[PDB]
Amino acid sequence: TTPLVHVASVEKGRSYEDFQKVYNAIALKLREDDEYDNYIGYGPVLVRLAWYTSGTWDKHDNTGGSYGGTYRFKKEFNDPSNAGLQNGFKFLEPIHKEFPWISSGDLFSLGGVTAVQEMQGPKIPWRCGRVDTPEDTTPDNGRLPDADKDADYVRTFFQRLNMNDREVVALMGAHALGKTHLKNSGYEGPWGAANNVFTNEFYLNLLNEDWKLEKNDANNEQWDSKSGYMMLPTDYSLIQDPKYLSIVKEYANDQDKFFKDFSKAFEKLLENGITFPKDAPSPFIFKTLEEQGL
Numbered sequence: 218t219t220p221l222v223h224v225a226s227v228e229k230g231r232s233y234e235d236f237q238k239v240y241n242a243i244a245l246k247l248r249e250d251d252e253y254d255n256y257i258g259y260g261p262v263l264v265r266l267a268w269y270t271s272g273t274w275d276k277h278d279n280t281g282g283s284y285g286g287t288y289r290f291k292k293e294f295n296d297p298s299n300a301g302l303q304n305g306f307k308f309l310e311p312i313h314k315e316f317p318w319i320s321s322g323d324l325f326s327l328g329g330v331t332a333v334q335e336m337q338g339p340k341i342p343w344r345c346g347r348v349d350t351p352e353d354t355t356p357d358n359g360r361l362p363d364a365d366k367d368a369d370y371v372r373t374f375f376q377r378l379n380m381n382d383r384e385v386v387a388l389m390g391a392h393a394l395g396k397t398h399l400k401n402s403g404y405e406g407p408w409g410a411a412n413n414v415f416t417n418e419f420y421l422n423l424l425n426e427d428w429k430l431e432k433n434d435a436n437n438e439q440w441d442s443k444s445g446y447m448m449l450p451t452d453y454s455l456i457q458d459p460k461y462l463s464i465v466k467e468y469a470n471d472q473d474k475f476f477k478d479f480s481k482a483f484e485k486l487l488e489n490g491i492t493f494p495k496d497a498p499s500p501f502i503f504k505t506l507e508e509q510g511l
């Protein structure tokens with residue numbers, strides 16, 4: 218129906234200190250469960266989870282997004298589009314039990330922020346206030362992007378999330394993290410070498426590696442390199458399109474610029490659909506465990 222408004226409402230009496238504690242719990246668990254996914258750790262899947270939940274947003278009617286924290290996944294994670302995300306939810310369950318006061322949307326988004334920062338990425342300002350909407354669930358059905366498409370598809374798709382060319386290229390840099398798993402999405406292989414360290418490696422690999430279009434064991438095409446890396450058709454489209462290519466080169470040659478742009482685009486992604494009161498607290502910038510000496 219009519220595009221309802223979602224006003225951020227601070228968890229009763231909570232402030233910076235409370236959220237830094239949740240951040241720390243997530244960060245400590247990331248350090249503890251280091252064996253996950255052949256020692257890649259849960260960092261990447263938490264970032265994917267933050268992106269996926271926020272990526273359901275539609276600027277046209279303000280449905281989906283991170284605010285409600287209530288989703289219905291097609292085939293209950295048994296679909297190529299969402300398979301694997303259950304690992305992120307399982308990881309966050311213990312965190313939510315220790316801090317039952319934090320909303321689901323705040324937890325999912327904070328999980329992504331914490332993961333990026335702990336993996337040495339840029340600081341990502343984060344705002345609290347998302348409110349659970351149990352009577353309003355958002356099916357992920359066809360709301361997230363397909364990986365077997367070209368640049369035109371990518372550009373059009375991201376317009377629904379109100380992201381421009383630079384924002385799209387910056388956000389895609391998160392693929393420096395983790396890997397594709399054949400049993401999950403029908404794609405197999407990591408995008409780079411340091412799977413759990415946030416850097417601009419995604420762009421360097423796109424430009425510097427020798428890519429070959431091959432078919433994986435799920436009969437899907439993907440670009441593979443001799444180094445053992447891979448790129449989805451949508452990732453590779455960033456160097457096939459002349460406008461995207463210019464930006465890829467920019468980030469491949471300026472680590473600081475990429476960090477700054479990613480930080481802005483990621484916060485925007487996590488905040489799409491949310492109306493923050495004029496007197497809402499300012500965004501929080503959490504200290505890493507390293508910065509706290511923990």
Ligand code: HEM
Nearest residue numbers: 261262265268301363364388391395396397398401402451
């Ligand atoms: C055209 C856009 C995108 C497409 C088609 C896409 C597709 C995929 C696919 C197929 C996987 C593999 C899932 C698996 O097999 O486990 C994946 C993983 C991942 N994606 Fe993307 N993605 C897109 C955008 C993004 C964005 C914007 C972010 C976040 C800023 C992101 C973060 C991640 C991360 C961190 C992983 C690794 C998860 C893990 O290792 O478990 N993706 N994505």
